[PDB]
Swiss-Prot record, chain B:
This is Multidrug export protein EmrA. Homodimer and homotrimer. Part of the tripartite efflux system EmrAB-TolC, which is composed of an inner membrane transporter, EmrB, a periplasmic membrane fusion protein, EmrA, and an outer membrane component, TolC. The complex forms a large protein conduit and can translocate molecules across both the inner and outer membranes. Interacts with EmrB. EmrAB complex forms a dimer in vitro. It is found in: Cell inner membrane. The chain holds residues 152 to 201 of 390 of the full protein. It comes from the Bacteria. Belongs to the membrane fusion protein (MFP) (TC 8.A.1) family. Part of the tripartite efflux system EmrAB-TolC, which confers resistance to antibiotics such as CCCP, FCCP, 2,4-dinitrophenol and nalidixic acid. EmrA is a drug-binding protein that provides a physical link between EmrB and TolC. It comes from Escherichia coli (strain K12).
Length: 50, 50, 50
């Protein structure tokens, strides 16, 4: 029974890591949105500068 | 109706998308740490049985 | 964890001693209530052939 409990705990921890992956993907998405905005703002300034 | 600048609307849409990304991050943070508490009852949790 | 569970299962299943021979029981020395170890002689099996 002790060994079986250990197996269950290990399975749960692995599942937690797999979820953390998705969390990091969401963080990537927010950073990408920020970059896209900062890029859009700059392309409005070049024609004025010319 | 062509009243406000386009960069104001762009910044509104970007804000909405960023907020959605942040909510996704929060939901994922919750989904992890719910893998540990899968078992409904406190007495049945793997740690206690050990 | 699976390796640890398999070792536990083997240890549990080895609680039934099995005879590796088709013979006859000669010098029994094990009695119920006895405390035995992997070195204690329990009985003997002597084949009737060869």
């Amino acid at each position: 029974e002790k060994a079986k409990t250990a197996l269950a705990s290990s399975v749960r921890q692995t599942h937690q890591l797999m979820i953390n992956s998705k969390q990091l993907q969401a963080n990537i998405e927010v950073q990408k949105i920020a970059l896209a905005k900062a890029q859009s703002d700059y392309n409005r300034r070049v024609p004025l500068g010319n | 109706a062509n009243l406000i600048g386009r960069e104001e609307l762009q910044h509104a849409r970007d804000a909405v998308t960023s907020a959605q990304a942040q909510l996704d991050v929060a939901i994922q943070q919750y989904n992890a740490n719910q893998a540990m508490i899968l078992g409904t009852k406190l007495e049945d949790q793997p740690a206690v049985q050990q | 964890a699976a390796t640890e569970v398999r070792n536990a299962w083997l240890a549990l299943e080895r609680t039934r001693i099995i005879s590796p021979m088709t013979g006859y029981v000669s010098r029994r020395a094990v009695q119920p209530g006895a405390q035995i170890s992997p070195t204690t002689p329990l009985m003997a099996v002597v084949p009737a052939t060869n």
